[PDB]
Design an enzyme around this catalytic site. Structure first.
Site, short mmCIF file in Angstrom:
data_model
loop_
_atom_site.label_atom_id
_atom_site.label_comp_id
_atom_site.label_asym_id
_atom_site.label_seq_id
_atom_site.Cartn_x
_atom_site.Cartn_y
_atom_site.Cartn_z
N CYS B 167 0.85 -1.23 0.00
CA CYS B 167 0.00 0.00 0.00
C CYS B 167 0.87 1.26 0.00
CB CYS B 167 -1.07 -0.09 1.10
SG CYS B 167 -2.23 -1.44 0.83
N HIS B 304 -2.52 8.66 5.08
CA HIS B 304 -2.79 7.33 4.55
C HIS B 304 -4.24 6.94 4.84
CE1 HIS B 304 -1.74 3.58 2.76
NE2 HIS B 304 -1.90 2.88 3.86
N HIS B 341 -9.68 3.09 -0.42
CA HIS B 341 -8.23 2.99 -0.36
C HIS B 341 -7.76 2.19 -1.57
CE1 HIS B 341 -4.14 2.36 0.73
NE2 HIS B 341 -4.33 1.05 0.76
P1 LIG Z 1 -4.49 -8.08 14.01
O1 LIG Z 1 -5.07 -7.39 15.20
O2 LIG Z 1 -3.12 -7.70 13.55
O3 LIG Z 1 -5.52 -7.89 12.81
C1 LIG Z 1 -5.11 -8.06 11.45
C2 LIG Z 1 -5.49 -6.85 10.61
C3 LIG Z 1 -5.75 -7.28 9.19
C4 LIG Z 1 -6.74 -6.21 11.18
C5 LIG Z 1 -4.26 -5.91 10.56
O4 LIG Z 1 -3.61 -5.83 11.83
C6 LIG Z 1 -4.58 -4.51 10.08
O5 LIG Z 1 -5.57 -3.88 10.39
N1 LIG Z 1 -3.61 -4.06 9.29
C7 LIG Z 1 -3.36 -2.84 8.55
C8 LIG Z 1 -4.10 -1.64 9.10
C9 LIG Z 1 -3.85 -0.58 8.06
O6 LIG Z 1 -4.76 -0.01 7.50
N2 LIG Z 1 -2.57 -0.36 7.80
C10 LIG Z 1 -2.00 0.58 6.84
C11 LIG Z 1 -1.15 -0.26 5.90
S1 LIG Z 1 -2.20 -1.45 5.04
C1 LIG Z 2 -1.47 -2.75 1.76
O1 LIG Z 2 -0.44 -2.61 2.37
C2 LIG Z 2 -2.25 -4.04 1.71
C3 LIG Z 2 -1.59 -5.07 0.83
C4 LIG Z 2 -0.97 -4.50 -0.43
C5 LIG Z 2 -1.80 -4.68 -1.69
C6 LIG Z 2 -2.07 -6.13 -2.07
C7 LIG Z 2 -3.16 -6.33 -3.10
C8 LIG Z 2 -3.68 -7.74 -3.18
#
Ligand SMILES: *P(=O)(O)OCC(C)(C)[C@H](O)C(=O)NCCC(=O)NCCS
Ligand SMILES: *C(=O)CCCCCCC
Ligand SMILES: *C(=O)CCCCCCC
Lengths: 79, 412, 412
Positions: B167, B304, B341
């Site tokens: 991302c 972000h 996003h």
């Molecule tokens: P866990 O409590 O780690 O839950 C997993 C999830 C997928 C909820 C994860 O921690 C999460 O929320 N990750 C990214 C949050 C976000 O928006 N990050 C910015 C980079 S994608």
């Molecule tokens: C962002 O950090 C979440 C993962 C990156 C894009 C992957 C698309 C399948």
């Protein structure tokens, strides 16, 4: 009571292999993140493997309120 | 001390096919999230996305070539064509002049590229064997084919580079282009982040980790960065493109100058594979490095801000820490409410948005602000755009794997 | 300008689990290409590949985490562990020291990353619906998760960057690391290229464009770069890894010095999505810029040399044109005969191989040279390795989309 106990045994077996821990630590009062070394990712994958091993389907909102292994077993019991 | 300016811009997303229509809709607080129609999501737990419904690939490609490109590449060609045309660089045949071509490269960014193509060909091989694998599969899915197709369409022969930092890929793509020009490897770079992954396994992948909002009954209320009732991001598709140019060469050409690059920062969390570092520590360091390079007063921050619990929380903490206090945080908005996003494209889209905000003295708002989060206590320009001139803007991107990128552009 | 040295190396491929065993087998002209066993290829037009059969993932990560990482990432953790240990930089906990962690980053490269994982979950989703998509799908498959897992494993918090420029990804990952140190974004960079795509949709994808050799009966003779009987590449899996450090920092901490980075070049053909530019024109420009940057006499060239008709030809043409004549081209070899072409990982593997050739005065040979190709008329070090001291080595990589990268290292 015996049916509940067998269900608990199966759930404990499934949790052990997933988190790579002994059946010793997976007690009804054991917390996944604090007591079993699992993160949210581990938890959601454990929840999946229980839905596949038992043919059940936990709705999204129930999985939200899962802190200790007892929580998982009691949900599977309501069934 | 090679100075670097932005001389052309383009973007496509779920609120418009070009940067004018899109930014207007975004500044007005419209929302492009809708129910998914590009595949059958009726049995899915997540049924909403920022889909672009008015895009015709045959308007950017010869109809025979559409089959050769994943949708993300098609969106990249739309956005890069707009930015290239916007730059005035193109000759009568819509190609780079041959004597400038060796010193103009392309920096592209995407998270996964042609996921739908890989999913489709994977199923073909599994059900009917490898003879059913389409020959156009590989060159339609690879992330770097964004730079492949664009360099061929515009005849640009400089460094051809591609970033796949999840991302943060769109923002890192800007930074790699900047670094290339700073080290004299090019005089101009086309930058483009592009992503289109609204497909069964892409939606399934993110729902499997519970990262997506399941507010299926109200698509336009699901994406709500920093709001207390946020519950996951909404996946969007799109592409943003910029032309970067060394300053003296831009002035010689008579180029228009949207902005001047001022600084950047990059870091890794070294913490968790999807969750951010405690207190957004990696974000803090990337922002601090960018700010100390830019040495300007930032008047707007495009966050972000994905509408996840963790990101919006730890981004707010890191912002407060890097500027000193809540009062010292500039106006902050995330436009992911409006367009979703957009993953690897988000950083490129949001650099275009940030720069246009600067150009027009209009700071677009974070929409769907209905319930203040006590842990998210900054000024998020709630619901309505703010008319305010600013002299520099900062844009943040974070990705899985804990990779962070920040860029600052200043008025010029 | 800051000077940069290589202080640690590692590699894993179809001829060895570390750089010592691997290089020896490569210099002896052995061949790791085998009949495919990692999946049922019995119905496939291509049934050979450079498979690693002795790799155990539970040696580089604990059993609980193996499921979370695609095979290319498991291979990357193996190679980087070797390089990080080789470098002597780890502390008593096998982590980067905390006071150095912010200034050491990772630059990773792969062409597609966890393809087999995308393929598997795509099929899960198609057969059983999205609830069967494993939560660990996404972070097991994204290319930048190489830098994700490696940065968490070693606690390095500097710039975390990922190149995805197809078969040149491993060379571009080296160059992006160099750029970052040159511009003072880091003092050290872990570099790793890693690829593992021996799976049904991977083999079928390259078969459906006739890119692969179909000499299934003789896996050891299939890959024959520059030979007249070459008939396509042979896909290999592996990972190569380097530690780069600014020269003074390496001296101060008493580092082993394998080589000094000398020069690089990057270009795009802007010609065709799979075919090379006529006369290797883009390759020529990247090679000339690296040579003009390094300003050293290159004694050995590790060619891309994937054993395909057009690549091997146009790479030979470009080499003659850049060195002026066929007589002025230094000794050249491709080691893709020995380990197959490892796609995105090749650039990284071939930089390790090339530096070791220099270190040891042993130039590995191009194997399976049975019939001279009159149009490929260079010195390809045929069959037997050559004892020769060199003071600088150059490695070439080209990728789909016409993207070229070249690096030159010189003796310390
Ligand atoms: P866990 O409590 O780690 O839950 C997993 C999830 C997928 C909820 C994860 O921690 C999460 O929320 N990750 C990214 C949050 C976000 O928006 N990050 C910015 C980079 S994608
Ligand atoms: C962002 O950090 C979440 C993962 C990156 C894009 C992957 C698309 C399948
Ligand atoms: C090399 O350029 C050919 C394509 C490499 C992509 C990664 C493997 C699918």
């Amino acid at each position: 009571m015996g049916y509940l106990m067998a269900l608990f045994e199966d759930i404990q077996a499934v949790i052990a292999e997933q988190l790579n821990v002994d059946a010793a630590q997976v007690t009804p009062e054991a917390e996944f993140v604090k007591d079993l070394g699992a993160d949210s990712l581990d938890v959601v994958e454990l929840i999946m493997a229980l839905e596949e091993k038992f043919g059940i389907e936990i709705p999204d909102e129930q999985a939200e309120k899962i802190v200790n292994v007892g929580d998982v077993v009691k949900y599977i019991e309501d069934n | 001390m090679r100075r670097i300016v932005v001389t052309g811009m383009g973007m496509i997303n779920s609120l418009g096919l070009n940067k004018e229509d899109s930014f207007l809709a975004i500044a007005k607080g419209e929302c492009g999230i809708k129910h998914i129609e590009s595949f059958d999501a009726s049995a899915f737990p997540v049924r909403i996305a920022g889909e672009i419904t008015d895009f015709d690939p045959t308007e950017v490609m010869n109809p025979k070539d559409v089959k050769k490109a994943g949708r993300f590449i098609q969106l990249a060609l739309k956005a890069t064509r707009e930015a290239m045309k916007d730059s005035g660089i193109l000759d009568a045949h819509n190609r780079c002049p041959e004597e400038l071509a060796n010193r103009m490269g392309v920096s592209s960014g995407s998270g996964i590229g042609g996921l739908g193509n890989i999913e489709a060909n994977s199923i073909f091989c599994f059900e009917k064997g490898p003879r059913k694998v389409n020959p156009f599969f590989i060159t339609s899915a690879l992330v770097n084919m964004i730079g492949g197709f664009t360099s061929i369409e515009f005849g640009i022969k400089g460094p051809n580079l591609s970033s796949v930092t999840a991302c943060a890929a769109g923002t890192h793509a800007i930074i790699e282009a900047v670094k290339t020009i700073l080290l004299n490897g090019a005089d101009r770079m086309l930058v483009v982040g592009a992503e289109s992954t609204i497909c069964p396994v892409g939606i399934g992948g993110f729902a499997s980790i519970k990262a997506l909002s399941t507010r299926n009954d109200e698509p336009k209320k699901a994406s709500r960065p920093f709001d207390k009732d946020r519950n996951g991001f909404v996946m969007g598709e799109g592409a943003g493109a910029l032309v970067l140019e060394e300053y003296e060469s831009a002035k010689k050409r008579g180029a228009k100058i949207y902005a001047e690059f001022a600084g950047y920062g990059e870091s890794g969390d070294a913490n968790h594979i999807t969750a951010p570092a405690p207190e957004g520590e990696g974000a803090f360091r990337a922002m601090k490095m960018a700010l100390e390079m830019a040495k300007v007063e930032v008047g707007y921050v495009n966050a972000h801000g994905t509408s996840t619990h963790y990101n919006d929380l730890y981004e707010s903490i890191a912002l407060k820490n890097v500027f000193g206090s809540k009062e010292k945080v500039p106006p902050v908005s995330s436009t992911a409410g409006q367009i979703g996003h957009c993953l690897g494209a988000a950083g490129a889209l949001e650099a275009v948005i940030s720069i246009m905000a600067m150009n027009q003295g209009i700071l677009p708002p974070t929409i769907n602000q209905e319930t203040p989060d006590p842990e998210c206590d900054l000024d998020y320009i709630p619901n309505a755009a703010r008319e305010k001139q600013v002299d520099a803007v900062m844009s943040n991107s974070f990705g899985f794997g804990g990779t962070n990128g920040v860029v600052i552009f200043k008025k010029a």
